[PDB]
Amino acid sequence: VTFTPYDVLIPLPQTVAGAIRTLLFYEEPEFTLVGIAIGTEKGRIYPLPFNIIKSEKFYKVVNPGRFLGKLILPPKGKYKSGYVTESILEKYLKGELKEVEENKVIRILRIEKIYAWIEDPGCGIKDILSSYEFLTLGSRVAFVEVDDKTPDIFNRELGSTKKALFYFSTPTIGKVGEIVQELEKRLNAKIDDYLLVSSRPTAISGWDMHEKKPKGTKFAIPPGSVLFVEFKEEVEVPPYIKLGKLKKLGYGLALGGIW
Amino acid sequence: ALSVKDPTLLRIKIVPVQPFIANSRKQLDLWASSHLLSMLMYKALEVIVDKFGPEHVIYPSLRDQPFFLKFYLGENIGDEILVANLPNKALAIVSGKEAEKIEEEIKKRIRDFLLQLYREAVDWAVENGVVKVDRSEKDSMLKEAYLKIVREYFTVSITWVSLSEKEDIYQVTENAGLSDEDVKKWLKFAAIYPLLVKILDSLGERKVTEERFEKSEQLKGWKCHVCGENLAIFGDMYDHDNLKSLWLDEEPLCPMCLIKRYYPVWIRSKTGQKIRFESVVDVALLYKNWRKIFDEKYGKDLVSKAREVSEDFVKDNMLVDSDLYYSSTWESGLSDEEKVKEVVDFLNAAYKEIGNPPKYYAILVMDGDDMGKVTPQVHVAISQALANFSIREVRSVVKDEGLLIYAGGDDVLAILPVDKALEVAYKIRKEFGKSFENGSLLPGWKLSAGILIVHYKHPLYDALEKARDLLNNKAKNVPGKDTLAIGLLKRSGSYYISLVGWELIRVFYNSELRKKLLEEKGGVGKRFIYHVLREVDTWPKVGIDEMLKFEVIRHIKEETKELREKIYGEIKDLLEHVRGNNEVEKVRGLFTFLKIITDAEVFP
Ligand SMILES: Nc1ncnc2c1ncn2[C@@H]1O[C@H](COP(=O)(O)OP(=O)(O)OP(=O)(O)O)[C@@H](O)[C@H]1O
Ligand code: NA
Ligand code: NA
Numbered sequence: 001v002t003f004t005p006y007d008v009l010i011p012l013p014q015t016v017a018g019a020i021r022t023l024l025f026y027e028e029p030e031f032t033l034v035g036i037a038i039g040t041e042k043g044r045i046y047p048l049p050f051n052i053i054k055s056e057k058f059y060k061v062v063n064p065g066r067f068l069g070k071l072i073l074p075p076k077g078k079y080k081s082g083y084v085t086e087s088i089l090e091k092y093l094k095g096e097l098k099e100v101e102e103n104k105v106i107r108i109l110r111i112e113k114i115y116a117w118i119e120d121p122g123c124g125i126k127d128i129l130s131s132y133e134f135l136t137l138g139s140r141v142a143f144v145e146v147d148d149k150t151p152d153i154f155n156r157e158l159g160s161t162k163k164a165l166f167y168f169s170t171p172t173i174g175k176v177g178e179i180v181q182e183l184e185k186r187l188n189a190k191i192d193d194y195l196l197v198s199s200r201p202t203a204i205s206g207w208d209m210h211e212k213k214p215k216g217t218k219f220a221i222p223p224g225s226v227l228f229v230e231f232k233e234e235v236e237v238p239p240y241i242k243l244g245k246l247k248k249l250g251y252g253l254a255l256g257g258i259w
Numbered sequence: 260a261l262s263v264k265d266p267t268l269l270r271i272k273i274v275p276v277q278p279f280i281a282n283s284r285k286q287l288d289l290w291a292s293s294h295l296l297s298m299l300m301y302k303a304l305e306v307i308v309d310k311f312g313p314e315h316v317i318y319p320s321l322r323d324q325p326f327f328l329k330f331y332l333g334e335n336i337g338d339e340i341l342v343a344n345l346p347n348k349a350l351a352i353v354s355g356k357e358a359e360k361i362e363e364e365i366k367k368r369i370r371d372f373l374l375q376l377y378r379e380a381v382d383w384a385v386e387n388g389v390v391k392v393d394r395s396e397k398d399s400m401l402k403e404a405y406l407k408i409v410r411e412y413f414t415v416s417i418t419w420v421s422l423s424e425k426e427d428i429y430q431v432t433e434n435a436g437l438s439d440e441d442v443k444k445w446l447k448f449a450a451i452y453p454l455l456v457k458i459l460d461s462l463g464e465r466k467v468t469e470e471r472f473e474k475s476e477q478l479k480g481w482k483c484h485v486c487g488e489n490l491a492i493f494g495d496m497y498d499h500d501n502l503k504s505l506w507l508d509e510e511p512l513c514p515m516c517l518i519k520r521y522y523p524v525w526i527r528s529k530t531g532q533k534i535r536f537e538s539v540v541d542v543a544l545l546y547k548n549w550r551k552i553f554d555e556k557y558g559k560d561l562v563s564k565a566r567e568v569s570e571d572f573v574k575d576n577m578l579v580d581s582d583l584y585y586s587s588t589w590e591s592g593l594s595d596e597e598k599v600k601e602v603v604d605f606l607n608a609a610y611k612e613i614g615n616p617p618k619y620y621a622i623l624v625m626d627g628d629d630m631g632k633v634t635p636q637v638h639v640a641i642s643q644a645l646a647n648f649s650i651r652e653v654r655s656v657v658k659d660e661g662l663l664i665y666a667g668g669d670d671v672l673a674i675l676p677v678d679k680a681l682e683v684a685y686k687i688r689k690e691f692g693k694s695f696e697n698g699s700l701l702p703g704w705k706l707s708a709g710i711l712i713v714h715y716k717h718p719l720y721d722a723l724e725k726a727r728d729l730l731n732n733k734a735k736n737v738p739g740k741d742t743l744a745i746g747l748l749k750r751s752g753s754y755y756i757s758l759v760g761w762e763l764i765r766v767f768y769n770s771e772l773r774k775k776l777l778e779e780k781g782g783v784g785k786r787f788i789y790h791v792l793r794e795v796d797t798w799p800k801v802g803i804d805e806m807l808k809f810e811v812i813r814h815i816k817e818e819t820k821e822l823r824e825k826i827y828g829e830i831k832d833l834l835e836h837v838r839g840n841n842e843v844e845k846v847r848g849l850f851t852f853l854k855i856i857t858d859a860e861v862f863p
């Protein structure tokens with residue numbers, strides 16, 4: 001896929017998608033906005049997973065226990081909003097970090113870069129936007145670079161395992177049941193149990209140009225939310241998977257993990 | 260009680276809480292949101308009471324809840340009733356068989372209840388000119404689009420566990436991941452109630468999360484102005500301008516925010532009770548009894564001049580809006596003209612004699628850290644105590660000093676005028692302390708609070724976010740907690756934060772220092788505070804004590820030597836009660852604090 005970073009000098013996905021959508025003088029679009037990432041001097045960053053809680057100058061990754069045959073999370077301290085490096089998250093997704101020093105968590109738009117991942121079905125976005133450019137953000141201006149290289153997170157070889165988690169990089173729009181159900185199908189597998197660790201539903205609304213009024217309100221699982229799953233049988237957990245509504249708008253980017 | 264078949268632990272949780280309250284443009288909305296929420300628990304609690312009665316509700320202790328008195332026993336209660344004393348979590352002991360029925364019923368009981376309010380709200384809105392439309396159109400307001408919003412908005416989650424079950428602590432402790440904490444409860448060699456509860460939460464949190472995401476999509480159209488999230492009623496039908504027209508005050512309203520506007524009147528009909536202050540300005544003006552005195556001295560006249568300006572400006576010899584007290588309101592933002600000058604000038608003259616009007620008020624949030632004191636009966640006594648503290652102790656403190664909105668036990672939400680903020684928080688803290696007879700020096704029960712001082716023009720939702728931030732993010736991140744976090748947000752946008760121990764209120768009050776600042780005019784050295792803060796930008800080479808000593812001298816004849824001793828002495832005392840990892844952090848905190856309580860614009 002094309003990899004589009006902006007240098008700036010939710011409706012985040014919508015804004016980005018529209019922007020691209022909008023750039024092309026020359027309702028989802030034809031192309032698909034897989035997802036987006038926030039950027040800083042430290043590169044890409046992601047909302048801190050909801051199962052990582054601060055304590056003792058440290059953030060503890062807490063894993064589920066199966067109570068009454070039911071997946072659950074041990075009673076712990078409140079979630080503290082934050083961000084983590086792409087480096088840290090990958091460790092997380094492999095269940096290979098037991099904790100992160102507090103200093104590392106990134107409380108710090110107030111933003112330096114925004115990354116766009118796009119599947120261009122011969123819309124010729126790469127060559128056209130490829131021209132080194134400064135483009136109008138949907139007002140503010142940005143510098144645009146485009147690379148044909150897909151991000152490392154996207155290509156990872158997770159093991160094949162019965163226990164997988166899905167971390168939502170972007171707001172995913174769906175009821176829990178539909179999502180797991182949609183999941184079961186795409187992986188063509190059956191899920192014995194699942195636990196969703198998340199904050200209260202996010203209200204996402206966007207403009208309808210033709211109707212010329214605000215779009216119907218939808219409720220999305222907030223980013224950083226994690227879905228733990230116990231499959232009936234061994235499944236090759238994908239590096240990432242798109243779920244829920246408004247996919248081509250950058251929604252429903254869930255990154256694969258294990259536990 | 261305690262004798263039953265298949266006793267089961269049942270837990271109830273209601274959401275959303277803070278997000279709901281935050282969606283308030285006015286104090287009245289804020290109050291309604293808090294009150295309504297408690298009511299929902301009550302409805303939910305009714306089911307258990309009907310089925311088993313109060314004593315089977317461990318938390319909260321029902322026996323004295325006014326709601327309980329005035330809705331289950333029809334006792335007469337008075338303005339006591341306005342305060343929301345019911346939290347959004349509860350647990351009872353009940354039979355296993357009837358439990359699932361309880362789950363269905365509560366969900367339904369609240370669901371039906373919300374639906375009523377919407378409908379009574381609909382009639383109300385259309386009649387009194389809130390919605391301004393041909394009653395023919397009324398049928399439109401009851402369509403599924405709007406009904407669904409009301410049904411779906413709140414998730415009340417019910418969960419339960421068998422109190423009689425085959426038990427292995429090895430296995431039970433195992434599924435929940437909590438090691439190195441076994442001896443106190445791993446050790447049972449002579450039922451696991453305390454551990455049992457915590458799992459319930461873990462279990463409860465699983466259900467609430469699923470159930471709160473089962474949320475239907477909405478139709479296109481303009482959103483409620485207050486909440487900004489749900490389609491404004493008639494939102495689908497009209498263009499924005501015309502739609503703005505159907506609504507009084509130009510505020511289109513979704514269902515869940517419409518119920519908010521109606522809710523106040525509904526309690527009144529039910530209880531003939533209303534809160535004294537519908538506005539923050541109403542609470543702001545309490546400061547120095549400034550309003551009492553002014554309305555009385557000039558208040559009498561003020562309307563006719565104002566009345567002379569507009570017929571619709573006021574009713575009943577009373578101003579419609581309290582912000583009319585501020586000349587600035589006249590000066591600009593009004594929404595025939597000669598009168599303006601004399602009033603403005605009239606009011607400015609008024610300020611001359613009495614002093615300027617307070618435009619600042621305080622939000623007080625307090626929470627109990629960290630609950631509880633980890634036997635079902637032991638739990639009950641604690642609950643009864645918490646209920647007693649909340650219902651009576653807190654009420655007596657806030658009584659007549661401002662607006663007490665919510666007291667769920669450990670937790671509190673109050674709106675106070677600046678002059679009584681510190682006074683009240685400390686008092687509550689003490690009462691809380693005595694009520695558990697905790698003896699210092701080394702207490703817990705501990706309690707933390709957040710005090711946000713905001714300009715009246717400041718958006719309510721934001722004030723609430725910040726105030727909660729102070730409590731959770733500042734006060735409770737302090738090791739040992741039991742802290743008070745004060746934030747002064749100024750219309751300029753300048754935000755000042757000070758974290759302090761509780762006794763600091765005590766020490767500073769009754770300090771000569773306070774007196775000099777209070778007896779500041781004729782004043783104490785100006786820039787005293789700026790100068791000290793400047794030296795704490797970095798470690799004074801001289802050292803902290805010297806600089807203090809130094810600065811104390813620069814600002815303050817035989818007595819002058821005696822006075823500086825005291826001030827320097829008093830300052831040294833306070834720093835003991837200012838949070839901060841280092842002496843430098845403490846000095847800023849103390850002097851930042853001084854900066855706060857001494858701001859002329861905040862404390863005329
Ligand atoms: N009716 C009410 N009016 C005002 N405030 C309330 C009301 N009910 C609860 N609160 C306060 O708001 C808080 C919101 O609780 P929340 O929904 O976050 O669940 P919680 O598990 O208590 O969360 P946390 O403990 O992490 O704050 C409660 O702890 C309570 O103290
Ligand atoms: Na909360
Ligand atoms: Na608490």
Ligand SMILES: [Zn+2]
Pocket residue numbers: 483484485486487488489512513514515516517
């Ligand atoms: Zn609304």
